[PDB]
Amino acid sequence: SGAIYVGNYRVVNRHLATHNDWANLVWEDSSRDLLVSSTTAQGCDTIARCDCQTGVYYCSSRRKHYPVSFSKPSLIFVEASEYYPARYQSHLMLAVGHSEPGDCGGILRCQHGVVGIVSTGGNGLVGFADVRDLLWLDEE
Numbered sequence: 001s002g003a004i005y006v007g008n009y010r011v012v013n014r015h016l017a018t019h020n021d022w023a024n025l026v027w028e029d030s031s032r033d034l035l036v037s038s039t040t041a042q043g044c045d046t047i048a049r050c051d052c053q054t055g056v057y058y059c060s061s062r063r064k065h066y067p068v069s070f071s072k073p074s075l076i077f078v079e080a081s082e083y084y085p086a087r088y089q090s091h092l093m094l095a096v097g098h099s100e101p102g103d104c105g106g107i108l109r110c111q112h113g114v115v116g117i118v119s120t121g122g123n124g125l126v127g128f129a130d131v132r133d134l135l136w137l138d139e140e
């Protein structure tokens with residue numbers, strides 16, 4: 001589980017979005033596993049605006065933050081998980097590390113702020129759904 005709270009936006013994995021998220025929908029994209037809903041309270045997370053390929057992510061299944069190198073956001077084939085079929089996922093960044101389904105929503109951060117949230121796992125890789133291209137998160 002986990003979310004990004006920026007301005008009046010809540011960023012979650014689409015597959016974990018709640019009824020309240022869908023009833024307050026701003027934007028969703030299945031191919032990215034992202035959903036954004038509107039909040040009544042202002043959020044304080046800073047979104048990274050950068051092309052960093054190093055940062056730190058939270059791994060709930062190890063209660064640990066790991067420093068990792070990660071690939072640039074790309075269209076990648078993801079093998080079947082308990083929450084998605086085998087399919088292509090867009091704007092996905094891979095690192096070498098541990099990821100289980102319950103780790104979805106863990107923050108990846110760099111020196112510029114929030115890069116993305118854990119979205120995929122398995123075969124010793126962790127996949128992160130990038131949010132750095134969503135510049136509208138910072139305004140309105």
Ligand SMILES: [Zn+2]
Pocket residue numbers: 048049050051052110111112113
């Ligand atoms: Zn950065």
